[PDB]
Design an enzyme around this catalytic site. Sequence first.
Site, mmCIF file in Angstrom:
data_model
loop_
_atom_site.group_PDB
_atom_site.id
_atom_site.type_symbol
_atom_site.label_atom_id
_atom_site.label_comp_id
_atom_site.label_asym_id
_atom_site.label_seq_id
_atom_site.Cartn_x
_atom_site.Cartn_y
_atom_site.Cartn_z
ATOM 1 C CD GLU A 16 -2.446 -1.180 2.742
ATOM 2 O OE1 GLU A 16 -1.742 -0.992 3.769
ATOM 3 O OE2 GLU A 16 -3.669 -1.359 2.783
ATOM 4 C CG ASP A 203 -13.156 -5.975 2.885
ATOM 5 O OD1 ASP A 203 -12.052 -5.408 2.885
ATOM 6 O OD2 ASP A 203 -13.783 -6.236 3.917
HETATM 7 C C1 LIG Z 1 -3.864 -8.428 6.117
HETATM 8 S S1 LIG Z 1 -4.688 -7.762 7.546
HETATM 9 C C2 LIG Z 1 -5.729 -6.498 6.827
HETATM 10 C C3 LIG Z 1 -4.962 -5.167 6.612
HETATM 11 O O1 LIG Z 1 -5.727 -4.324 5.746
HETATM 12 C C4 LIG Z 1 -6.679 -3.539 6.504
HETATM 13 N N1 LIG Z 1 -8.107 -4.042 6.309
HETATM 14 C C5 LIG Z 1 -8.833 -3.954 5.150
HETATM 15 C C6 LIG Z 1 -9.916 -4.865 5.238
HETATM 16 C C7 LIG Z 1 -10.318 -4.947 6.469
HETATM 17 C C8 LIG Z 1 -11.450 -5.458 7.114
HETATM 18 N N2 LIG Z 1 -12.573 -5.894 6.481
HETATM 19 N N3 LIG Z 1 -11.392 -5.486 8.482
HETATM 20 C C9 LIG Z 1 -10.278 -5.043 9.113
HETATM 21 N N4 LIG Z 1 -9.175 -4.546 8.500
HETATM 22 C C10 LIG Z 1 -9.147 -4.498 7.153
HETATM 23 C C11 LIG Z 1 -6.154 -3.576 7.960
HETATM 24 O O2 LIG Z 1 -6.157 -2.261 8.610
HETATM 25 C C12 LIG Z 1 -4.802 -4.338 7.890
HETATM 26 O O3 LIG Z 1 -3.627 -3.540 7.654
#
Ligand SMILES: CSC[C@H]1O[C@@H](n2ccc3c(N)ncnc32)[C@H](O)[C@@H]1O
EC number: 3.2.2.16
Lengths: 245, 246
Positions: A16, A203
């Site tokens: 990112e 998502d």
């Molecule tokens: C691989 S862990 C997910 C990462 O992307 C973010 N992320 C995006 C989707 C999402 C979700 N549905 N719930 C919690 N964190 C999420 C978070 O802040 C973390 O760095």
Amino acid sequence: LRPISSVVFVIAMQAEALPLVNKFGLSETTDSPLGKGLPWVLYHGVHKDLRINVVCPGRDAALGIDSVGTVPASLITFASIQALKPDIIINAGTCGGFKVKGANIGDVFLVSDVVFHDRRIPIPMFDLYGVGLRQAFSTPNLLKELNLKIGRLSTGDSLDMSTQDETLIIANDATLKDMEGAAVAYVADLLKIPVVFLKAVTDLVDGDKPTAEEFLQNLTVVTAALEGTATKVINFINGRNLSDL
Amino acid sequence: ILRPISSVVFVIAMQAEALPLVNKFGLSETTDSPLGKGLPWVLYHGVHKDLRINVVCPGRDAALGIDSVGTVPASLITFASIQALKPDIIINAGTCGGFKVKGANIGDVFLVSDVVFHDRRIPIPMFDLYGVGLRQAFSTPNLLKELNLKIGRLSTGDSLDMSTQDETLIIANDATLKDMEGAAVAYVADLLKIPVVFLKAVTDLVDGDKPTAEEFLQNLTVVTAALEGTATKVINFINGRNLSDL
Ligand SMILES: CSC[C@H]1O[C@@H](n2ccc3c(N)ncnc32)[C@H](O)[C@@H]1O
Ligand SMILES: CSC[C@H]1O[C@@H](n2ccc3c(N)ncnc32)[C@H](O)[C@@H]1O
């Protein structure tokens, strides 16, 4: 006030971070300023009136993947502020969003305020401490001029969502769900540094795709949207003081 | 190593867990912000024979006025303490939940074998194991033989209560003890390569009934004396030793 001169981006996953590192031709710091032997990654540069730094928690020494979640995000926020003394922190990343709250995949939201959904302490006044409601720095002109969606962010250390998690997220009326933001706010608050969030929706938590699978499938295209928006935020901030936004 | 231990940092989450030990060793609250100015953190310092003793607490939350419990403040104070105070060893000491079915009794002070999280659920490959955060406490076999403390695995999360999801992972990870800071202290200790040990005093039985007011108050004085007394004997044992000796 005096014009903003130094911005630090806090970004949980290197993927990112990197498109933004390119856009501004930042270079990887080589001298481990935040601590020798740490897995942390820092990129630095200078763009017009602004020093730009971007810090990531980096890969886990043992398991080799990005060190996501509240604790590392909190540590790099703390260490980067102490070392660089920025005027503003920007926590930029992907997130879950709620359709019912008007979130769509690819949307990059500004955050109005932030809470935690997984710090449940059922003693009075510890209960409020655990929720950890903190306001982002007021940026109304940025909001208005970039035409960003805005909503409340809810943070916990899990990517899925338990029943109790869902109960608190709903009760707190969050639009957005992540794993770092409220902890970044806690440290920004602790050290009295203005904090702003850019949370790009990968998502739909209340949609019909499984979270993990949708998050992964949409990561690259949404990261690009995040880069676009972060780039405009940097350009907008350039030459402003905190009152101007 | 074999260099004798000269400096011990105690990371203690609540000031009520810290003050008895502070009084026992006559440590003084520092006047001059060794961990950075303008912070709610509290540092108590003293020397006890061959040993420099620092006790650090995240202190009062600026918005709500209560103790800054949980993994974030703990991780932050640990990081800043390591960087400023350069200890030879960290001791995370405090109260916890215990499972009577794993042999925990109220008033027991456990030495922790290893640490995990129960609330970092990341169900994608290799991030799942990262969320577990499994780390080993520093091996202290002589202290264990000497003090005869119970031992078991500690499971950490940011909630005082226990959801069913939490219980599931706590059981799966085979934890004896339950807290809100331990695995976060360990994570930081590991980052910065500092030996870490844990003294965890069982205040409630996660799998037992609610105490009456009378019981809770009487148990509290017991837990308080047990924690203070065990931490005292740990300091006394460390004194004159290198890490190899314990
Ligand atoms: C691989 S862990 C997910 C990462 O992307 C973010 N992320 C995006 C989707 C999402 C979700 N549905 N719930 C919690 N964190 C999420 C978070 O802040 C973390 O760095
Ligand atoms: C005021 S939150 C409780 C504090 O005591 C500890 N503690 C006590 C028992 C307990 C439990 N049953 N579950 C989780 N943390 C607990 C935690 O680590 C935290 O610092």
